[PDB]
Amino acid sequence: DVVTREYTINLHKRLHGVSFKKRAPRAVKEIKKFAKLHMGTDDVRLAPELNQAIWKRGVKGVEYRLRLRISRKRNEEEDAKNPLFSYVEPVLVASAKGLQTVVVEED
Amino acid sequence: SSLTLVKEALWSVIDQGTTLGGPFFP
Amino acid sequence: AAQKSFRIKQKMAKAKKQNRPLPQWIRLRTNNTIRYNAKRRNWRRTKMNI
């Protein structure tokens, strides 16, 4: 099922106590795990702009909350082992506070 | 052998009139 | 060295021309017992010692 939603992820409690050299890579892995939890897809692809947003303040300066646009779409290749995958994009907003999970109508 | 049979067959097989033009240069 | 003598350069040229594996048609000869180049030299394995 093709679908698209917007979420807020709390990276602060997921990176609590993490060594400084591992904070941004662990944020990447936690975002992949977050998308897998919310979409049931083992194949999660992060946008390079999202990677820039994660790494913007260095290896140990990840933001507490991130606003993500997650799209579950169809894998068109025959050789792929899964028919669906998730694609995570950044939602650059004024603030990531006080936002709820919403559904984006696809046109 | 099929090659032997083929070679044997080939070995056994190999073992007025007309006038065109005329006295001129076309 | 960059500024080398002609004797050294000539020995280097002979070594360069010797640096090769066997020609493949050697292996096809009758009663051939040579199967590899047992005197092959590489620049990082055995030094020529001038």
Partner: protein, 99 residues
């Protein structure tokens, strides 16, 4: 944009008709050599069947040195049976040979 798109037209030619889907048209060499480039390894063997036979012979011959993990024909490092500096030890109260 419509004017630019209508200007950018693709018209097929004889090259597109004849070689549009075809490839090669020339046998690729085993060592990636040019037309008049000498091949030291393979010039003495005219036919590819004997080339493949010679290649198989060389690959079968290579197996023992591969098992011995030689870097090549030029890797002929020889180890001694015993090292005297390792088997010549009587360590008194004084100067030693290693720390």
């Amino acid at each position: 944009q419509n004017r630019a798109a209508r200007k950018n037209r693709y018209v097929e030619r004889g090259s597109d008709v004849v070689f549009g889907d075809q490839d090669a048209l020339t046998a690729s060499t085993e060592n990636g050599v040019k037309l008049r480039q000498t091949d030291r390894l393979l010039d003495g063997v005219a036919d590819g069947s004997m080339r493949s036979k010679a290649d198989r012979m060389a690959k079968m011959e290579r197996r023992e040195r591969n098992r011995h993990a030689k870097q090549g024909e030029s890797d002929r490092h020889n180890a001694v049976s015993l090292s005297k500096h390792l088997f010549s030890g009587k360590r008194g109260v004084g100067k030693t040979d290693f720390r």
